[PDB]
Symmetry: C3
Subunit: 173 residues, 3 copies
Amino acid sequence: VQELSVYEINELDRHSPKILKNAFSLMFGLGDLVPFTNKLYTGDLKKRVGITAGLCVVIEHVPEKKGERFEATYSFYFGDYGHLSVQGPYLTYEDSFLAITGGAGIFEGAYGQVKLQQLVYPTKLFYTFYLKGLANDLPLELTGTPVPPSKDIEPAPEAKALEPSGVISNYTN
Amino acid sequence: VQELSVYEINELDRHSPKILKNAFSLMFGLGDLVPFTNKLYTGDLKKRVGITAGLCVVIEHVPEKKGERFEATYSFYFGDYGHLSVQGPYLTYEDSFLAITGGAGIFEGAYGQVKLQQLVYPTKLFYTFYLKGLANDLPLELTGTPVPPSKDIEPAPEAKALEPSGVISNYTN
Amino acid sequence: VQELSVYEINELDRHSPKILKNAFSLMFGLGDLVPFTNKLYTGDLKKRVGITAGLCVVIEHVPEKKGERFEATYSFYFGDYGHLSVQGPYLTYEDSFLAITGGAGIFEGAYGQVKLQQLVYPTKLFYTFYLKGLANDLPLELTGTPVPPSKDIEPAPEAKALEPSGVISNYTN
Ligand SMILES: CC/C=C\C[C@H]1C(=O)C=C[C@@H]1CCCCCCCC(=O)O
Ligand SMILES: CC/C=C\C[C@H]1C(=O)C=C[C@@H]1CCCCCCCC(=O)O
C-alpha cells in the first residue's frame, strides 16, 4: 500500500456545486443531482495538483443527522501524472470510505479504498487513498508529509496564487 | 472466487425509483435518468443488510424485447461491513452481467463480475457476485445458502421488521 | 497487456447525443449532462461489434482550446463477448486516457487504461485499450490490423449494412 493524501478545496470560482433540484421534497432527496468540480492540492498543502470532477447523486435526506447521503462517481486529476477514479458514499455528516475504481497514467492499475474526511462543509475535504496496484513509487512531490487535517488548514499562499513553486507541471484546471 | 448472493427489493418506502424525463417519447428513451435506491437482503433472505444506491441512465427502448436498456452505476451497502460498486448493463427484459468496479471495508480490493437476475419487474432482483480479491473469507451471516430465486420469495419477517435477529449491525438505510 | 483498438461512430440513428441543458450559458458548462450511445466497430472496420453507452458530465468550457472538458462514465459493448467499463476525462479538443474500471464476459477481471483519440468532433473516435487481467487471448476477429486513424474512416459496407459477414455474433444494438 502507498498512502496518498490530498486536500479538496472549493474556492467557489468553478461554478461548483451545481444543484439540479428535482426531488419530491424541499430538502435534498432522491432525484436531486449535483455535478461538481473542486480544486485539488497535495497533502502537505504546498502545491496545486489539479481538480476533482464528477457527479453526486442524492440518495436520501438523513434528518436524525441533519445531513444528506450521496452516491458519488468522480475523478481526481494530478496534471500530467494522470488520474484516480472512485465510486461510493459521500455523507455530509460523517466520514466515509469510497472504492478506487481505477486510474490512468502513473495511477494505471490502481485499486483499494479511500478515506473521505470533511473538515468544513462544503469547502474543505481531506482524502487518504490506500493505493495498491501501482507500477512505481509515487513521485516525491506528491508524498510530502501531510498537514494534519483540521478546519483551519489552508493551501500554501503561493499554491493558491499559482506561482511556479506552488504548482505541479501542467496542473489540471 | 467467493460467491455472494443478495436480493434487492423495492418496498416502496424510499421514494424510489425517481424518473427524470427528457426523451421525447412516451416510452423510456435516451435522456431519461433514473436515480434509485432499494433494500438489500441476504441471499438466504434471513437478514436486512442495507441498500442499493445509484443511477440508471436510459440508453434505448427495445420494443421487440418489451423492455429497456439502461446503463447503471451504483453501489451495494452492507452496513458496518462496507460496500461493493458496479458498472454495466441493466436490461429490464433479461439477465445480464455487470463489472465489479471496486469495494470498501471487507470488500476492499474486490473485482470480478456480478450476475443480475430478473425476478419480478420492477420490484425484485437477485444478484450473484463472483468476488475476487477479498482479504478474508466472507462472514457467515452473509453466506447462508441462498433461497432459489422465484417470483414469490419474501424476506424473513424479522428482517422486514428490522428486529435485531433479522439485521446486520448498522444495516444501511 | 493486450491491446484492443475500436472505432466509435455516431451514425445519427440512435437519438444520440442527448443534451440536458442546465448551465445558464449558451456554451457547455457545469450542470449540463449528455447521455449518449454510439456504434462500435472493430479496429480494422470490418465488423460491427456493438455500442457505447453512458453519460458525459460537463465539467467546464475551455475557451483557450475552443472545446469542453467532460467527466465520462460509460461502457463498450461487444455482443456475446461481454463489455468494458470506463471512467475519466473526455476532452473535445485533445486526446486523453480513461481508467478501465472493470468488465464482464471475456473481459471479466479487466483493468488498465484506454486512450481516446478524437478524429471528427462530434462523430468519430478511435480507442486503444491497454488491457490487463483477461483470462484469455482476445478473439482474432477483434485483433485485426487497424485502419489508419483519420477523419475519413468508414466501416466496411457489409458492417454498416449488418450483413452476417460484417457483424460479430449477437452484436449489441
Ligand atoms: C429491485 C428492482 C426495483 C426497481 C427497478 C427500478 C430501479 O430501482 C432501477 C431501475 C428500475 C426502473 C423501473 C421504472 C419502472 C417503474 C417506475 C415507477 C415506480 O415503480 O414507482
Ligand atoms: C463518437 C463521438 C460522437 C459524439 C460525441 C458526443 C457523445 O456521444 C458524447 C459526448 C459528445 C457530445 C457532443 C456534443 C456536440 C454538440 C456540438 C455539436 C457540434 O459539434 O457542432
